[PDB]
Ligand code: HEC
Ligand code: HEC
């Protein structure tokens with residue numbers, strides 16, 4: 001029913017990163033430096049296996065500061081969380097979608113059962129609703 | 137007295153990231169998006185302990201493409217590597233300094249036994265020659 005807060009996600013595998021800057025269509029609300037993390041189960045899916053129930057992907061979003069031709073990580077703005085449960089999250093393609101303001105377990109953001117999240121991630125049906133690609 | 141190639145570093149703990157853009161005093165050679173990784177042993181030092189022998193820090197440098205106000209990871213340019221051995225690397229303050237072109241074990245970049253690396257990292261003697269700070 002609810003997505004679990006992914007405790008210890010900072011110790012997980014770093015999948016990839018990207019920076020979204022002002023002018024980007026998604027500056028509101030995912031402007032900043034983001035890092036994608038995967039637990040062991042999510043790595044199975046990312047490698048081209050299937051995602052086991054209990055796979056978790058985290059979108060970790062930082063604000064950044066301009067420091068002399070460097071973008072420096074500032075405060076955490078939020079995390080997004082995808083948790084795999086084929087049965088419990090069947091209404092949103094087997095992934096539960098949640099946001100935590102500032103990465104705080106007490107600041108749950110999603111109000112529509114993740115239908116908005118799923119609406120965009122649906123475009124990625126062929127890669128099991130995951131945008132991020134495992135890179136070397 | 138050569139630094140070992142840190143095989144499996146991509147599975148290690150992600151410490152932090154930073155973007156170095158053109159015009160930065162160090163754009164040559166570390167312009168791009170970099171990610172710092174730490175093995176279990178390096179984490180002990182980042183948390184406020186003594187860096188044990190066998191601690192490894194990796195500076196993982198990607199080129200990026202600026203595309204519609206996103207900075208998107210491209211190809212790996214290089215890795216930098218600090219390997220802790222108080223005895224073997226005593227001439228450079230107990231860290232061995234190496235680079236690998238494109239992160240490939242056969243493309244060693246350091247030609248002065250790491251004296252140039254050490255010359256800058258010496259400013260951080262008080263944090264055992266490490267710039268990166270562990271963040272949550
Ligand atoms: C399109 C308009 C999107 C909406 C709405 C949401 N997400 Fe999404 N998400 C999107 C992109 C383009 C990416 C890839 C970023 C990259 O660096 O390549 C993501 C990624 C995630 C991830 C990581 C897993 C993955 O699919 O790559 C998570 C955990 C995630 N997003 C969660 C999430 C939630 C909880 C949303 C609703 C609150 C949500 N997303 C909206 C595109 C879009
Ligand atoms: C100053 C003029 C530097 C020189 C020359 C070298 N490095 Fe360094 N390095 C520098 C900074 C400011 C940072 C921090 C980056 C950040 O995101 O905060 C780094 C970092 C590293 C790391 C990561 C560990 C750390 O100390 O934070 C490694 C593994 C590293 N550098 C290796 C390295 C090597 C191999 C060098 C000579 C080839 C070298 N660096 C030189 C500053 C400077």
Ligand SMILES: [Zn+2]
Nearest residue numbers: 068069159160
């Ligand atoms: Zn300038």
